[PDB]
């Protein structure tokens, strides 16, 4: 490259940096994905157990 | 799945829970199984041993 209007300079290439991007949690694949249609979602839960049978 | 009268929503999934049932004693196989016919059973014992001899 030129310097001022009559001299020259040496060019030493570019230097670039970027910040961190952490993907440890994402990499573990813990989460699942579901694709739907509406903006309101429902969930259902069912609880079941057992009984203590006696003698007769 | 139906939301309020004039709106809808997306059903996602079902969640179910139940208390644990233990099987350790069953696994150890410490009990022998007998299939009888009546509602009464008999057991026979026969215990034997020995004594000490005195000088005469």
């Amino acid at each position: 490259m030129q310097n001022g209007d009559f001299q020259i300079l040496d060019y030493t290439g570019l230097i670039s940096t970027m910040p961190r991007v952490d993907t440890l949690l994402q990499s573990m694949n813990l989460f699942t994905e579901h694709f739907g249609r509406t903006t309101v979602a429902r969930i259902e839960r069912l609880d079941d157990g057992a009984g203590d049978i006696k003698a007769v």
Side-chain angles (χ1 to χ4, degrees), chain A residues 23-56:
Chain A
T23 74
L24 160 58
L25 178 56
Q26 314 205 299
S27 64
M28 290 186 287
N29 197 0
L30 194 70
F31 275 84
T32 57
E33 312 196 18
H34 302 264
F35 300 96
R37 289 178 163 150
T38 186
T39 307
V40 185
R42 268 206 189 151
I43 310 99
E44 308 197 348
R45 172 183 264 250
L46 160 58
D47 293 329
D48 188 13
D52 198 35
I53 189 167
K54 287 201 181 193
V56 187

PDB file of all heavy atoms in Angstrom, chain A residues 23-56:
ATOM      1  N   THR A  23     -21.569 -24.556  23.958  1.00  0.00           N
ATOM      2  CA  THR A  23     -22.557 -25.547  23.554  1.00  0.00           C
ATOM      3  C   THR A  23     -22.508 -26.813  24.399  1.00  0.00           C
ATOM      4  O   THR A  23     -22.992 -27.858  23.948  1.00  0.00           O
ATOM      5  CB  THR A  23     -22.364 -25.914  22.077  1.00  0.00           C
ATOM      6  OG1 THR A  23     -21.203 -26.743  21.933  1.00  0.00           O
ATOM      7  CG2 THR A  23     -22.199 -24.661  21.229  1.00  0.00           C
ATOM      8  N   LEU A  24     -21.941 -26.753  25.605  1.00  0.00           N
ATOM      9  CA  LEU A  24     -21.854 -27.945  26.441  1.00  0.00           C
ATOM     10  C   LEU A  24     -23.238 -28.518  26.727  1.00  0.00           C
ATOM     11  O   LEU A  24     -23.478 -29.715  26.546  1.00  0.00           O
ATOM     12  CB  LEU A  24     -21.127 -27.610  27.747  1.00  0.00           C
ATOM     13  CG  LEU A  24     -21.345 -28.555  28.933  1.00  0.00           C
ATOM     14  CD1 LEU A  24     -20.929 -29.976  28.583  1.00  0.00           C
ATOM     15  CD2 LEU A  24     -20.579 -28.059  30.145  1.00  0.00           C
ATOM     16  N   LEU A  25     -24.163 -27.667  27.173  1.00  0.00           N
ATOM     17  CA  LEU A  25     -25.507 -28.142  27.487  1.00  0.00           C
ATOM     18  C   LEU A  25     -26.202 -28.688  26.245  1.00  0.00           C
ATOM     19  O   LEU A  25     -26.848 -29.741  26.298  1.00  0.00           O
ATOM     20  CB  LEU A  25     -26.328 -27.015  28.113  1.00  0.00           C
ATOM     21  CG  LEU A  25     -27.781 -27.346  28.461  1.00  0.00           C
ATOM     22  CD1 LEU A  25     -27.862 -28.542  29.390  1.00  0.00           C
ATOM     23  CD2 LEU A  25     -28.460 -26.137  29.084  1.00  0.00           C
ATOM     24  N   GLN A  26     -26.077 -27.986  25.119  1.00  0.00           N
ATOM     25  CA  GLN A  26     -26.730 -28.429  23.893  1.00  0.00           C
ATOM     26  C   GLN A  26     -26.162 -29.760  23.421  1.00  0.00           C
ATOM     27  O   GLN A  26     -26.897 -30.632  22.946  1.00  0.00           O
ATOM     28  CB  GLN A  26     -26.578 -27.362  22.807  1.00  0.00           C
ATOM     29  CG  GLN A  26     -26.879 -25.949  23.287  1.00  0.00           C
ATOM     30  CD  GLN A  26     -27.324 -25.034  22.163  1.00  0.00           C
ATOM     31  OE1 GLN A  26     -26.587 -24.806  21.203  1.00  0.00           O
ATOM     32  NE2 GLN A  26     -28.535 -24.502  22.280  1.00  0.00           N
ATOM     33  N   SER A  27     -24.845 -29.935  23.546  1.00  0.00           N
ATOM     34  CA  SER A  27     -24.198 -31.131  23.016  1.00  0.00           C
ATOM     35  C   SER A  27     -24.716 -32.401  23.680  1.00  0.00           C
ATOM     36  O   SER A  27     -24.750 -33.461  23.043  1.00  0.00           O
ATOM     37  CB  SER A  27     -22.685 -31.025  23.194  1.00  0.00           C
ATOM     38  OG  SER A  27     -22.335 -30.995  24.569  1.00  0.00           O
ATOM     39  N   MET A  28     -25.118 -32.324  24.945  1.00  0.00           N
ATOM     40  CA  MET A  28     -25.513 -33.517  25.686  1.00  0.00           C
ATOM     41  C   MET A  28     -26.792 -34.137  25.134  1.00  0.00           C
ATOM     42  O   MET A  28     -27.126 -35.276  25.475  1.00  0.00           O
ATOM     43  CB  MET A  28     -25.693 -33.194  27.170  1.00  0.00           C
ATOM     44  CG  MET A  28     -24.397 -32.884  27.901  1.00  0.00           C
ATOM     45  SD  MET A  28     -24.626 -32.687  29.678  1.00  0.00           S
ATOM     46  CE  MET A  28     -25.434 -31.094  29.751  1.00  0.00           C
ATOM     47  N   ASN A  29     -27.520 -33.408  24.291  1.00  0.00           N
ATOM     48  CA  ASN A  29     -28.756 -33.834  23.651  1.00  0.00           C
ATOM     49  C   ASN A  29     -29.850 -34.114  24.678  1.00  0.00           C
ATOM     50  O   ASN A  29     -30.690 -34.980  24.439  1.00  0.00           O
ATOM     51  CB  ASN A  29     -28.575 -35.085  22.767  1.00  0.00           C
ATOM     52  CG  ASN A  29     -29.717 -35.280  21.789  1.00  0.00           C
ATOM     53  OD1 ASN A  29     -30.663 -34.494  21.753  1.00  0.00           O
ATOM     54  ND2 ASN A  29     -29.635 -36.339  20.990  1.00  0.00           N
ATOM     55  N   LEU A  30     -29.867 -33.418  25.817  1.00  0.00           N
ATOM     56  CA  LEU A  30     -30.843 -33.716  26.857  1.00  0.00           C
ATOM     57  C   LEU A  30     -32.272 -33.458  26.398  1.00  0.00           C
ATOM     58  O   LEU A  30     -33.177 -34.237  26.716  1.00  0.00           O
ATOM     59  CB  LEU A  30     -30.537 -32.883  28.103  1.00  0.00           C
ATOM     60  CG  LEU A  30     -31.248 -33.293  29.392  1.00  0.00           C
ATOM     61  CD1 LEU A  30     -30.712 -34.619  29.910  1.00  0.00           C
ATOM     62  CD2 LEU A  30     -31.099 -32.204  30.443  1.00  0.00           C
ATOM     63  N   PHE A  31     -32.498 -32.380  25.654  1.00  0.00           N
ATOM     64  CA  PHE A  31     -33.846 -31.931  25.337  1.00  0.00           C
ATOM     65  C   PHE A  31     -34.397 -32.635  24.103  1.00  0.00           C
ATOM     66  O   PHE A  31     -33.653 -33.048  23.209  1.00  0.00           O
ATOM     67  CB  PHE A  31     -33.863 -30.419  25.108  1.00  0.00           C
ATOM     68  CG  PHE A  31     -34.002 -29.620  26.369  1.00  0.00           C
ATOM     69  CD1 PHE A  31     -32.893 -29.316  27.137  1.00  0.00           C
ATOM     70  CD2 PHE A  31     -35.242 -29.171  26.786  1.00  0.00           C
ATOM     71  CE1 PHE A  31     -33.017 -28.580  28.297  1.00  0.00           C
ATOM     72  CE2 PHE A  31     -35.374 -28.434  27.947  1.00  0.00           C
ATOM     73  CZ  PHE A  31     -34.259 -28.138  28.703  1.00  0.00           C
ATOM     74  N   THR A  32     -35.719 -32.766  24.069  1.00  0.00           N
ATOM     75  CA  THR A  32     -36.449 -33.256  22.910  1.00  0.00           C
ATOM     76  C   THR A  32     -37.203 -32.106  22.250  1.00  0.00           C
ATOM     77  O   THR A  32     -37.349 -31.022  22.822  1.00  0.00           O
ATOM     78  CB  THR A  32     -37.427 -34.362  23.307  1.00  0.00           C
ATOM     79  OG1 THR A  32     -38.322 -33.874  24.313  1.00  0.00           O
ATOM     80  CG2 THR A  32     -36.678 -35.574  23.842  1.00  0.00           C
ATOM     81  N   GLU A  33     -37.686 -32.356  21.036  1.00  0.00           N
ATOM     82  CA  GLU A  33     -38.350 -31.334  20.239  1.00  0.00           C
ATOM     83  C   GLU A  33     -39.701 -31.840  19.753  1.00  0.00           C
ATOM     84  O   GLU A  33     -39.826 -32.990  19.322  1.00  0.00           O
ATOM     85  CB  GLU A  33     -37.491 -30.928  19.037  1.00  0.00           C
ATOM     86  CG  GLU A  33     -36.042 -30.636  19.391  1.00  0.00           C
ATOM     87  CD  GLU A  33     -35.309 -29.883  18.298  1.00  0.00           C
ATOM     88  OE1 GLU A  33     -35.979 -29.295  17.422  1.00  0.00           O
ATOM     89  OE2 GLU A  33     -34.060 -29.880  18.316  1.00  0.00           O
ATOM     90  N   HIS A  34     -40.709 -30.972  19.830  1.00  0.00           N
ATOM     91  CA  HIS A  34     -42.040 -31.252  19.312  1.00  0.00           C
ATOM     92  C   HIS A  34     -42.528 -30.052  18.513  1.00  0.00           C
ATOM     93  O   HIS A  34     -42.436 -28.912  18.977  1.00  0.00           O
ATOM     94  CB  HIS A  34     -43.030 -31.564  20.438  1.00  0.00           C
ATOM     95  CG  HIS A  34     -42.619 -32.719  21.298  1.00  0.00           C
ATOM     96  ND1 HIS A  34     -43.079 -34.002  21.087  1.00  0.00           N
ATOM     97  CD2 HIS A  34     -41.799 -32.784  22.371  1.00  0.00           C
ATOM     98  CE1 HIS A  34     -42.554 -34.808  21.994  1.00  0.00           C
ATOM     99  NE2 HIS A  34     -41.775 -34.094  22.785  1.00  0.00           N
ATOM    100  N   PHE A  35     -43.046 -30.314  17.318  1.00  0.00           N
ATOM    101  CA  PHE A  35     -43.520 -29.275  16.410  1.00  0.00           C
ATOM    102  C   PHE A  35     -45.031 -29.401  16.273  1.00  0.00           C
ATOM    103  O   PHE A  35     -45.539 -30.483  15.960  1.00  0.00           O
ATOM    104  CB  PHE A  35     -42.840 -29.393  15.049  1.00  0.00           C
ATOM    105  CG  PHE A  35     -41.346 -29.265  15.109  1.00  0.00           C
ATOM    106  CD1 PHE A  35     -40.546 -30.392  15.160  1.00  0.00           C
ATOM    107  CD2 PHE A  35     -40.744 -28.020  15.113  1.00  0.00           C
ATOM    108  CE1 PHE A  35     -39.171 -30.279  15.214  1.00  0.00           C
ATOM    109  CE2 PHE A  35     -39.369 -27.898  15.170  1.00  0.00           C
ATOM    110  CZ  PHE A  35     -38.582 -29.032  15.220  1.00  0.00           C
ATOM    111  N   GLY A  36     -45.743 -28.299  16.502  1.00  0.00           N
ATOM    112  CA  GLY A  36     -47.192 -28.312  16.459  1.00  0.00           C
ATOM    113  C   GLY A  36     -47.788 -27.296  15.507  1.00  0.00           C
ATOM    114  O   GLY A  36     -47.166 -26.928  14.506  1.00  0.00           O
ATOM    115  N   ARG A  37     -49.006 -26.839  15.813  1.00  0.00           N
ATOM    116  CA  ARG A  37     -49.711 -25.880  14.967  1.00  0.00           C
ATOM    117  C   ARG A  37     -50.179 -24.626  15.692  1.00  0.00           C
ATOM    118  O   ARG A  37     -50.182 -23.556  15.076  1.00  0.00           O
ATOM    119  CB  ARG A  37     -50.936 -26.543  14.319  1.00  0.00           C
ATOM    120  CG  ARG A  37     -50.622 -27.558  13.240  1.00  0.00           C
ATOM    121  CD  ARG A  37     -51.903 -28.183  12.709  1.00  0.00           C
ATOM    122  NE  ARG A  37     -51.708 -28.847  11.424  1.00  0.00           N
ATOM    123  CZ  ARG A  37     -52.399 -29.900  11.006  1.00  0.00           C
ATOM    124  NH1 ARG A  37     -53.354 -30.442  11.747  1.00  0.00           N
ATOM    125  NH2 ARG A  37     -52.131 -30.418   9.812  1.00  0.00           N
ATOM    126  N   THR A  38     -50.582 -24.706  16.955  1.00  0.00           N
ATOM    127  CA  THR A  38     -51.197 -23.575  17.637  1.00  0.00           C
ATOM    128  C   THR A  38     -50.181 -22.899  18.557  1.00  0.00           C
ATOM    129  O   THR A  38     -49.000 -23.253  18.594  1.00  0.00           O
ATOM    130  CB  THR A  38     -52.437 -24.035  18.401  1.00  0.00           C
ATOM    131  OG1 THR A  38     -53.106 -22.898  18.961  1.00  0.00           O
ATOM    132  CG2 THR A  38     -52.063 -25.009  19.516  1.00  0.00           C
ATOM    133  N   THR A  39     -50.647 -21.905  19.318  1.00  0.00           N
ATOM    134  CA  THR A  39     -49.805 -21.167  20.249  1.00  0.00           C
ATOM    135  C   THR A  39     -50.055 -21.578  21.696  1.00  0.00           C
ATOM    136  O   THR A  39     -49.394 -21.058  22.601  1.00  0.00           O
ATOM    137  CB  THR A  39     -50.037 -19.658  20.091  1.00  0.00           C
ATOM    138  OG1 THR A  39     -49.879 -19.291  18.715  1.00  0.00           O
ATOM    139  CG2 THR A  39     -49.052 -18.862  20.931  1.00  0.00           C
ATOM    140  N   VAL A  40     -50.983 -22.504  21.934  1.00  0.00           N
ATOM    141  CA  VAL A  40     -51.314 -22.965  23.277  1.00  0.00           C
ATOM    142  C   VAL A  40     -51.170 -24.479  23.309  1.00  0.00           C
ATOM    143  O   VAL A  40     -51.733 -25.183  22.465  1.00  0.00           O
ATOM    144  CB  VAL A  40     -52.740 -22.536  23.685  1.00  0.00           C
ATOM    145  CG1 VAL A  40     -53.017 -22.909  25.127  1.00  0.00           C
ATOM    146  CG2 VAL A  40     -52.933 -21.039  23.476  1.00  0.00           C
ATOM    147  N   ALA A  41     -50.417 -24.980  24.287  1.00  0.00           N
ATOM    148  CA  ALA A  41     -50.106 -26.400  24.377  1.00  0.00           C
ATOM    149  C   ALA A  41     -50.636 -26.962  25.687  1.00  0.00           C
ATOM    150  O   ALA A  41     -50.639 -26.284  26.717  1.00  0.00           O
ATOM    151  CB  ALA A  41     -48.596 -26.650  24.275  1.00  0.00           C
ATOM    152  N   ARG A  42     -51.083 -28.215  25.633  1.00  0.00           N
ATOM    153  CA  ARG A  42     -51.613 -28.922  26.789  1.00  0.00           C
ATOM    154  C   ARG A  42     -50.771 -30.155  27.081  1.00  0.00           C
ATOM    155  O   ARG A  42     -50.151 -30.732  26.182  1.00  0.00           O
ATOM    156  CB  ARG A  42     -53.067 -29.353  26.568  1.00  0.00           C
ATOM    157  CG  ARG A  42     -54.110 -28.359  27.041  1.00  0.00           C
ATOM    158  CD  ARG A  42     -55.406 -29.078  27.376  1.00  0.00           C
ATOM    159  NE  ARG A  42     -56.505 -28.156  27.639  1.00  0.00           N
ATOM    160  CZ  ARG A  42     -57.785 -28.428  27.424  1.00  0.00           C
ATOM    161  NH1 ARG A  42     -58.173 -29.603  26.953  1.00  0.00           N
ATOM    162  NH2 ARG A  42     -58.700 -27.501  27.690  1.00  0.00           N
ATOM    163  N   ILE A  43     -50.758 -30.552  28.350  1.00  0.00           N
ATOM    164  CA  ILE A  43     -50.120 -31.786  28.788  1.00  0.00           C
ATOM    165  C   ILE A  43     -51.100 -32.536  29.678  1.00  0.00           C
ATOM    166  O   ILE A  43     -51.979 -31.938  30.307  1.00  0.00           O
ATOM    167  CB  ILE A  43     -48.794 -31.523  29.536  1.00  0.00           C
ATOM    168  CG1 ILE A  43     -47.906 -30.577  28.729  1.00  0.00           C
ATOM    169  CG2 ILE A  43     -48.064 -32.831  29.802  1.00  0.00           C
ATOM    170  CD1 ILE A  43     -47.972 -29.141  29.194  1.00  0.00           C
ATOM    171  N   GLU A  44     -50.945 -33.857  29.728  1.00  0.00           N
ATOM    172  CA  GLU A  44     -51.799 -34.719  30.531  1.00  0.00           C
ATOM    173  C   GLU A  44     -50.937 -35.618  31.400  1.00  0.00           C
ATOM    174  O   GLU A  44     -49.884 -36.094  30.963  1.00  0.00           O
ATOM    175  CB  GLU A  44     -52.717 -35.570  29.643  1.00  0.00           C
ATOM    176  CG  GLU A  44     -53.512 -34.767  28.627  1.00  0.00           C
ATOM    177  CD  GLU A  44     -54.680 -35.545  28.050  1.00  0.00           C
ATOM    178  OE1 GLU A  44     -54.744 -36.774  28.264  1.00  0.00           O
ATOM    179  OE2 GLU A  44     -55.537 -34.925  27.384  1.00  0.00           O
ATOM    180  N   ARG A  45     -51.387 -35.851  32.631  1.00  0.00           N
ATOM    181  CA  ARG A  45     -50.673 -36.680  33.588  1.00  0.00           C
ATOM    182  C   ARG A  45     -51.629 -37.699  34.183  1.00  0.00           C
ATOM    183  O   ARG A  45     -52.790 -37.389  34.463  1.00  0.00           O
ATOM    184  CB  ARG A  45     -50.047 -35.832  34.704  1.00  0.00           C
ATOM    185  CG  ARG A  45     -49.441 -36.641  35.845  1.00  0.00           C
ATOM    186  CD  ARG A  45     -48.903 -35.741  36.943  1.00  0.00           C
ATOM    187  NE  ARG A  45     -47.469 -35.508  36.803  1.00  0.00           N
ATOM    188  CZ  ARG A  45     -46.534 -35.988  37.614  1.00  0.00           C
ATOM    189  NH1 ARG A  45     -46.837 -36.755  38.650  1.00  0.00           N
ATOM    190  NH2 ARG A  45     -45.259 -35.694  37.381  1.00  0.00           N
ATOM    191  N   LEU A  46     -51.134 -38.921  34.378  1.00  0.00           N
ATOM    192  CA  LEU A  46     -51.916 -40.014  34.945  1.00  0.00           C
ATOM    193  C   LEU A  46     -51.115 -40.641  36.074  1.00  0.00           C
ATOM    194  O   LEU A  46     -49.953 -41.014  35.880  1.00  0.00           O
ATOM    195  CB  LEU A  46     -52.259 -41.055  33.877  1.00  0.00           C
ATOM    196  CG  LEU A  46     -52.640 -42.458  34.360  1.00  0.00           C
ATOM    197  CD1 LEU A  46     -53.840 -42.415  35.290  1.00  0.00           C
ATOM    198  CD2 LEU A  46     -52.922 -43.363  33.173  1.00  0.00           C
ATOM    199  N   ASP A  47     -51.733 -40.758  37.245  1.00  0.00           N
ATOM    200  CA  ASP A  47     -51.101 -41.338  38.423  1.00  0.00           C
ATOM    201  C   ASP A  47     -51.842 -42.607  38.816  1.00  0.00           C
ATOM    202  O   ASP A  47     -53.068 -42.596  38.960  1.00  0.00           O
ATOM    203  CB  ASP A  47     -51.104 -40.344  39.587  1.00  0.00           C
ATOM    204  CG  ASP A  47     -50.220 -39.144  39.327  1.00  0.00           C
ATOM    205  OD1 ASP A  47     -49.204 -39.294  38.616  1.00  0.00           O
ATOM    206  OD2 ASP A  47     -50.540 -38.046  39.831  1.00  0.00           O
ATOM    207  N   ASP A  48     -51.095 -43.696  38.989  1.00  0.00           N
ATOM    208  CA  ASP A  48     -51.661 -44.984  39.360  1.00  0.00           C
ATOM    209  C   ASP A  48     -50.809 -45.620  40.446  1.00  0.00           C
ATOM    210  O   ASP A  48     -49.609 -45.355  40.552  1.00  0.00           O
ATOM    211  CB  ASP A  48     -51.755 -45.923  38.147  1.00  0.00           C
ATOM    212  CG  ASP A  48     -52.511 -47.199  38.456  1.00  0.00           C
ATOM    213  OD1 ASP A  48     -53.167 -47.259  39.516  1.00  0.00           O
ATOM    214  OD2 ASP A  48     -52.450 -48.140  37.637  1.00  0.00           O
ATOM    215  N   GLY A  49     -51.443 -46.466  41.255  1.00  0.00           N
ATOM    216  CA  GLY A  49     -50.760 -47.115  42.356  1.00  0.00           C
ATOM    217  C   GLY A  49     -51.208 -48.545  42.577  1.00  0.00           C
ATOM    218  O   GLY A  49     -51.488 -49.270  41.619  1.00  0.00           O
ATOM    219  N   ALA A  50     -51.280 -48.960  43.839  1.00  0.00           N
ATOM    220  CA  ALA A  50     -51.672 -50.319  44.182  1.00  0.00           C
ATOM    221  C   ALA A  50     -52.355 -50.297  45.542  1.00  0.00           C
ATOM    222  O   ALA A  50     -52.471 -49.250  46.184  1.00  0.00           O
ATOM    223  CB  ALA A  50     -50.470 -51.267  44.184  1.00  0.00           C
ATOM    224  N   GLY A  51     -52.811 -51.465  45.969  1.00  0.00           N
ATOM    225  CA  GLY A  51     -53.523 -51.609  47.230  1.00  0.00           C
ATOM    226  C   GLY A  51     -52.941 -52.730  48.069  1.00  0.00           C
ATOM    227  O   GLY A  51     -52.292 -53.636  47.540  1.00  0.00           O
ATOM    228  N   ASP A  52     -53.177 -52.660  49.379  1.00  0.00           N
ATOM    229  CA  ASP A  52     -52.689 -53.670  50.321  1.00  0.00           C
ATOM    230  C   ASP A  52     -53.803 -54.684  50.596  1.00  0.00           C
ATOM    231  O   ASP A  52     -54.651 -54.516  51.476  1.00  0.00           O
ATOM    232  CB  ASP A  52     -52.203 -53.011  51.602  1.00  0.00           C
ATOM    233  CG  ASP A  52     -51.297 -53.915  52.416  1.00  0.00           C
ATOM    234  OD1 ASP A  52     -50.524 -54.685  51.812  1.00  0.00           O
ATOM    235  OD2 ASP A  52     -51.359 -53.853  53.662  1.00  0.00           O
ATOM    236  N   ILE A  53     -53.784 -55.761  49.813  1.00  0.00           N
ATOM    237  CA  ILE A  53     -54.785 -56.816  49.915  1.00  0.00           C
ATOM    238  C   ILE A  53     -54.706 -57.476  51.284  1.00  0.00           C
ATOM    239  O   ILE A  53     -53.617 -57.792  51.771  1.00  0.00           O
ATOM    240  CB  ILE A  53     -54.605 -57.856  48.793  1.00  0.00           C
ATOM    241  CG1 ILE A  53     -55.784 -58.828  48.780  1.00  0.00           C
ATOM    242  CG2 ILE A  53     -53.299 -58.614  48.968  1.00  0.00           C
ATOM    243  CD1 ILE A  53     -55.849 -59.689  47.540  1.00  0.00           C
ATOM    244  N   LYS A  54     -55.861 -57.683  51.912  1.00  0.00           N
ATOM    245  CA  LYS A  54     -55.926 -58.361  53.197  1.00  0.00           C
ATOM    246  C   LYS A  54     -56.487 -59.771  53.029  1.00  0.00           C
ATOM    247  O   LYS A  54     -56.957 -60.164  51.958  1.00  0.00           O
ATOM    248  CB  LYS A  54     -56.785 -57.566  54.180  1.00  0.00           C
ATOM    249  CG  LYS A  54     -56.126 -56.301  54.697  1.00  0.00           C
ATOM    250  CD  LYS A  54     -56.759 -55.845  56.001  1.00  0.00           C
ATOM    251  CE  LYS A  54     -56.117 -54.567  56.514  1.00  0.00           C
ATOM    252  NZ  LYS A  54     -56.498 -54.284  57.924  1.00  0.00           N
ATOM    253  N   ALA A  55     -56.433 -60.542  54.114  1.00  0.00           N
ATOM    254  CA  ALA A  55     -56.931 -61.908  54.103  1.00  0.00           C
ATOM    255  C   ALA A  55     -58.374 -61.955  54.589  1.00  0.00           C
ATOM    256  O   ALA A  55     -58.773 -61.191  55.472  1.00  0.00           O
ATOM    257  CB  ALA A  55     -56.056 -62.802  54.979  1.00  0.00           C
ATOM    258  N   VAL A  56     -59.154 -62.860  54.003  1.00  0.00           N
ATOM    259  CA  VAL A  56     -60.558 -63.038  54.354  1.00  0.00           C
ATOM    260  C   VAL A  56     -60.853 -64.531  54.409  1.00  0.00           C
ATOM    261  O   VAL A  56     -60.301 -65.313  53.627  1.00  0.00           O
ATOM    262  CB  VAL A  56     -61.492 -62.335  53.347  1.00  0.00           C
ATOM    263  CG1 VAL A  56     -62.931 -62.387  53.831  1.00  0.00           C
ATOM    264  CG2 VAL A  56     -61.047 -60.899  53.124  1.00  0.00           C
TER     265      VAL A  56
END
